[PDB]
Short mmCIF file of C-alpha atoms and ligand atoms in Angstrom, two decimals:
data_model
loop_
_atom_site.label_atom_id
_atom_site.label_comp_id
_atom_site.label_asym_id
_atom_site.label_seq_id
_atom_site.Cartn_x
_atom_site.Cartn_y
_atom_site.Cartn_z
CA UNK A 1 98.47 105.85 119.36
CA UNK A 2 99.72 109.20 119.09
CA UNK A 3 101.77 110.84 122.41
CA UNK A 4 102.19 114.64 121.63
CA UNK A 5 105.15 116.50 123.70
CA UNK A 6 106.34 120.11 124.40
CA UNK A 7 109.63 120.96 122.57
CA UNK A 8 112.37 122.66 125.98
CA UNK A 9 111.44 126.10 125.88
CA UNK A 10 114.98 127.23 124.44
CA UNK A 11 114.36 124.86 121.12
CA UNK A 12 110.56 126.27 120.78
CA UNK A 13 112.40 129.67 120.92
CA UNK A 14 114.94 128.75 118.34
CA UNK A 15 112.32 127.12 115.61
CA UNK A 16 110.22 130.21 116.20
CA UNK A 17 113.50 132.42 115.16
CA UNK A 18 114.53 129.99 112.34
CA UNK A 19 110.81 130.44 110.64
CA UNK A 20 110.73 134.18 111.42
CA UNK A 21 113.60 135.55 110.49
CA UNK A 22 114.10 137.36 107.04
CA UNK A 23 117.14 135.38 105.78
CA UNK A 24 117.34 134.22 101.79
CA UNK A 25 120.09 131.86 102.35
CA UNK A 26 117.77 128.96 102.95
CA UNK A 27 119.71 126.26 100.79
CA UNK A 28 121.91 125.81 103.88
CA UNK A 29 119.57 123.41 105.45
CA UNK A 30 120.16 120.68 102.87
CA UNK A 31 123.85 120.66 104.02
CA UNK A 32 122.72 120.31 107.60
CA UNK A 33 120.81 117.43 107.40
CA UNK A 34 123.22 115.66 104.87
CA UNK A 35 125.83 116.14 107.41
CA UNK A 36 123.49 114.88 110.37
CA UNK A 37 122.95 111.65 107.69
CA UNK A 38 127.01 111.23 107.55
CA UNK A 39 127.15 111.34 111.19
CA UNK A 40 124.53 108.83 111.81
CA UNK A 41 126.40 106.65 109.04
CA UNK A 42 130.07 107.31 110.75
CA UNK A 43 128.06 106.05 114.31
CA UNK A 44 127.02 102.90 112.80
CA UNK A 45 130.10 102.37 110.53
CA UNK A 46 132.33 102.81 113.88
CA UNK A 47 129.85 100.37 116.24
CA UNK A 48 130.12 97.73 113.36
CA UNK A 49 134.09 97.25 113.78
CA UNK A 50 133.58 95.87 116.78
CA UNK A 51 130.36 94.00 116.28
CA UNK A 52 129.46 92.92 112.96
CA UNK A 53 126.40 91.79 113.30
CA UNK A 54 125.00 95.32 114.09
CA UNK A 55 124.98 95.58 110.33
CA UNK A 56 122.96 92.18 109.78
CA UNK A 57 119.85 95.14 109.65
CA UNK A 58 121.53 96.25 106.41
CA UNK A 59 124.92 95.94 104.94
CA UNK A 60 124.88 99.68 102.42
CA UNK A 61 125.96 102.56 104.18
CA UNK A 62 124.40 105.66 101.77
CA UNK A 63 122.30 108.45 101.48
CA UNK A 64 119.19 109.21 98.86
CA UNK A 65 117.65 112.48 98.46
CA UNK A 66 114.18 111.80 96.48
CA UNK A 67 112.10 114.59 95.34
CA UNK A 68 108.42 114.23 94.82
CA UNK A 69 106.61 117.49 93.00
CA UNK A 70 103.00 115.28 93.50
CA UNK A 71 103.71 115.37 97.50
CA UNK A 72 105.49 118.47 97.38
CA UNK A 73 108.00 116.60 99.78
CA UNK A 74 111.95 116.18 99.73
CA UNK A 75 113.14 113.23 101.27
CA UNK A 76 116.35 112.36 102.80
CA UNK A 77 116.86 108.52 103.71
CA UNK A 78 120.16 107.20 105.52
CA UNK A 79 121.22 103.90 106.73
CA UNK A 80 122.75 105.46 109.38
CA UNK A 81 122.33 104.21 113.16
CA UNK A 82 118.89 105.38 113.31
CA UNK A 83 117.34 106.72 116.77
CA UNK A 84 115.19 105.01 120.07
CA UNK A 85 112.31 106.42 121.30
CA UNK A 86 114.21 107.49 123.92
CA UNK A 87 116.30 109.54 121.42
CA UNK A 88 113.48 110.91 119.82
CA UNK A 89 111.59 112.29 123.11
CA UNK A 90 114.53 112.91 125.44
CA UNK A 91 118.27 112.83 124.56
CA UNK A 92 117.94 115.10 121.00
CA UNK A 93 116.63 117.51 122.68
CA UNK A 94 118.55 117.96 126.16
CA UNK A 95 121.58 117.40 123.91
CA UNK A 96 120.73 120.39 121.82
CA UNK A 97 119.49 122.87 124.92
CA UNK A 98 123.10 124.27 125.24
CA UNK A 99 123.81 124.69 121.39
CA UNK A 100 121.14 126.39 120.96
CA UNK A 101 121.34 129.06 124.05
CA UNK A 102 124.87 129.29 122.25
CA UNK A 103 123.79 129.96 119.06
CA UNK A 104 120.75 132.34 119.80
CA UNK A 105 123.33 134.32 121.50
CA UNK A 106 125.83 134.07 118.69
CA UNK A 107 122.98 135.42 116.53
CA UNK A 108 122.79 138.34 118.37
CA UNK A 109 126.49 139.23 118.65
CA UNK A 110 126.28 139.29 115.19
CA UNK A 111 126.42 135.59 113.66
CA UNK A 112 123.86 134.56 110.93
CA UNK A 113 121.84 131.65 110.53
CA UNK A 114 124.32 129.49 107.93
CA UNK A 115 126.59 129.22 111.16
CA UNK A 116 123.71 126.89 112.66
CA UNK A 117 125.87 123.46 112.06
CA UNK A 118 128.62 125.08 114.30
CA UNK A 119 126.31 124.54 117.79
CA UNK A 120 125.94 121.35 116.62
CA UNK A 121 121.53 121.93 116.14
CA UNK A 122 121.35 122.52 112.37
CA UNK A 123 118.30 119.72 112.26
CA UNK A 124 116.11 122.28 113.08
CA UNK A 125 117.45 124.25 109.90
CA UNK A 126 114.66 121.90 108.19
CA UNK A 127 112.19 125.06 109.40
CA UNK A 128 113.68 127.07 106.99
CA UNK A 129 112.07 125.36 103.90
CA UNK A 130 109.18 123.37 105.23
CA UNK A 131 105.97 123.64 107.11
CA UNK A 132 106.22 120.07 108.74
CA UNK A 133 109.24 117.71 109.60
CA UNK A 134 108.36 113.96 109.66
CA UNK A 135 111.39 111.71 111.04
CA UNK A 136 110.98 107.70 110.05
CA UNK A 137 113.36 105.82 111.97
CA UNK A 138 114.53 102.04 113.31
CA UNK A 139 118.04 101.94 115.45
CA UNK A 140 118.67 97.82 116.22
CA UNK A 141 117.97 98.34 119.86
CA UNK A 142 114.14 99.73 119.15
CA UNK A 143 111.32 99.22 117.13
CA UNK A 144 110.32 101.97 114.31
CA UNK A 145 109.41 105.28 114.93
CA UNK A 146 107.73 108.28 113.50
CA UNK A 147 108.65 111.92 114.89
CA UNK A 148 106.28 114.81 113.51
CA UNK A 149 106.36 118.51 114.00
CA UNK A 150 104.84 121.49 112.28
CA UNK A 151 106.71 123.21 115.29
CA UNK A 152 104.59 126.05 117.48
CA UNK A 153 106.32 124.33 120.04
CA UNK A 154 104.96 120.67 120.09
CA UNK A 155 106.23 117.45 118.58
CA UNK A 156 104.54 114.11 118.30
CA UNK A 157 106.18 110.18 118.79
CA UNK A 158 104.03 106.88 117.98
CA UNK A 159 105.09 103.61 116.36
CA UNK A 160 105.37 103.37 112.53
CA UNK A 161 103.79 100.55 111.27
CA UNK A 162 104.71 101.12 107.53
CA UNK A 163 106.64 99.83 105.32
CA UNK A 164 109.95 98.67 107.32
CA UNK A 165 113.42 100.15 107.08
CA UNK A 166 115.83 97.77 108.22
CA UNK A 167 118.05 100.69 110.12
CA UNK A 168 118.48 103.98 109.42
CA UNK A 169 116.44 107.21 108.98
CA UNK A 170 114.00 108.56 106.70
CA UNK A 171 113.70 112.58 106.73
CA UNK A 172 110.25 113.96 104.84
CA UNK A 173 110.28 117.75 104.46
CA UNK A 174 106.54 118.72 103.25
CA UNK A 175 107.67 122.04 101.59
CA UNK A 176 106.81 125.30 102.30
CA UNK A 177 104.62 126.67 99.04
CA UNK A 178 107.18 129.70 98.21
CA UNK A 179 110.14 126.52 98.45
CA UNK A 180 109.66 124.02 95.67
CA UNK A 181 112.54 124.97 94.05
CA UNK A 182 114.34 122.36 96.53
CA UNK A 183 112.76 119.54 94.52
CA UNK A 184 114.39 120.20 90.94
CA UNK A 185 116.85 118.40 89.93
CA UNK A 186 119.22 120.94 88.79
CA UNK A 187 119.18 122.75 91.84
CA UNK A 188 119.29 120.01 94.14
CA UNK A 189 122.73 119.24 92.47
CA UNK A 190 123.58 122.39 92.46
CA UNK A 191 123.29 122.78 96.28
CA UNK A 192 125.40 118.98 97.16
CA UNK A 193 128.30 120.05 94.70
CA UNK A 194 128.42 123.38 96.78
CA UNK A 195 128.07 122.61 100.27
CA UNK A 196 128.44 118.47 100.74
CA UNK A 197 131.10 117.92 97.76
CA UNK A 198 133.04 115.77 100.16
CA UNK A 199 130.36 113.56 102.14
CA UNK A 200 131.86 110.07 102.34
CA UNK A 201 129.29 108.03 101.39
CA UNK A 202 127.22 108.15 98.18
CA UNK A 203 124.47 110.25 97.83
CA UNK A 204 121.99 109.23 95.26
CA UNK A 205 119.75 111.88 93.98
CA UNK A 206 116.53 110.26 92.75
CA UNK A 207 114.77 111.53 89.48
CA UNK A 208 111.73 111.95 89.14
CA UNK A 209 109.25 110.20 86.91
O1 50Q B 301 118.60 114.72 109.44
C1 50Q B 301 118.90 113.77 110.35
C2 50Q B 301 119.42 112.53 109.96
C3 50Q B 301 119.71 111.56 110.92
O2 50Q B 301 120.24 110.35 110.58
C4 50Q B 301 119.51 111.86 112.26
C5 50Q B 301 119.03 113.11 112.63
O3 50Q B 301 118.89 113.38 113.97
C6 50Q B 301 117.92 114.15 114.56
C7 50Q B 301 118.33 115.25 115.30
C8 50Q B 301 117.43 116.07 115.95
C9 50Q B 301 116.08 115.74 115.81
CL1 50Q B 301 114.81 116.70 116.62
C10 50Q B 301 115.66 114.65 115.07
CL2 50Q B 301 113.89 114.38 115.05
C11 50Q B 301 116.56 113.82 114.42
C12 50Q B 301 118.70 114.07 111.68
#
């Protein structure tokens, strides 16, 4: 069953700023959510030197980007640590309430949305392109979860009893209609050589058929 929870009032006030603000440079939040994919990779990568087996869920250590024109969906899948429930409804979010007071404030001092990754909340760059966010995840000390928001300031948690990942997490942007662009090939490349040239670990971008 479905639980459905109020995004903190500051990150409501941030998607609602990130899907109404006139600002072109939306290819920025494919660079945001690669880098939130490294991270998650260096976490897990790190917790394995000491502990081994906390890779027995899944040796590779990679990202895939995989367009799908059918869906109208870009997908972004890590082996990274993955996140708990307790992740998903709690610490993202208190983590991110003082990055994102800092950046809304940046914003009006005269920053601009790009500088997003710099307050550390660039997830929520996702807004720019799509109309819905759904986050498929499994860290080792939880079972799998699915995270779903078409933002107006409410987000939804239940238990995903698909197909399995092993670790890691699966990112599905449903695309705004004006945004398919974002699932061609040529610009997709286009967009990693330019902003995530020097991600350490492969990124595989899937073709479609
Ligand atoms: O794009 C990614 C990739 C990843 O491995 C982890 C990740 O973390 C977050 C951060 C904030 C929120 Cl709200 C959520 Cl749902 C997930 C984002």
């Amino acid at each position: 069953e479905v639980e459905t929870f109020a995004f903190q009032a500051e990150i409501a006030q941030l998607m609602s700023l990130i899907i109404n603000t006139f600002y072109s440079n939306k290819e920025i939040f494919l660079r945001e959510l690669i880098s939130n994919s490294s991270d998650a990779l260096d976490k897990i990568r790190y917790e394995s030197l000491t502990d081994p087996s906390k890779l027995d869920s899944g040796k590779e250590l990679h990202i895939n980007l995989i367009p799908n024109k059918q869906d109208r969906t870009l997908t972004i899948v890590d082996t990274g640590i993955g996140m708990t429930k307790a992740d998903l409804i709690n610490n993202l979010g208190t983590i991110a309430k003082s990055g994102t007071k800092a950046f809304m404030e940046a914003l009006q001092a005269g920053a601009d949305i790009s500088m997003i990754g710099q307050f550390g909340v660039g997830f929520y760059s996702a807004y720019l392109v799509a109309e819905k966010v759904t986050v498929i995840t499994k860290h080792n000390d939880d079972e799998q979860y699915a995270w779903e928001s078409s933002a107006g300031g409410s987000f939804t948690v239940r238990t995903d009893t698909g197909e399995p990942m092993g670790r890691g997490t699966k990112v599905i942007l449903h695309l705004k209609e004006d945004q398919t662009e974002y699932l061609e090939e040529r610009r997709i490349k286009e967009i990693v050589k330019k902003h995530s040239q020097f991600i350490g670990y492969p990124i595989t971008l899937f073709v479609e058929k």
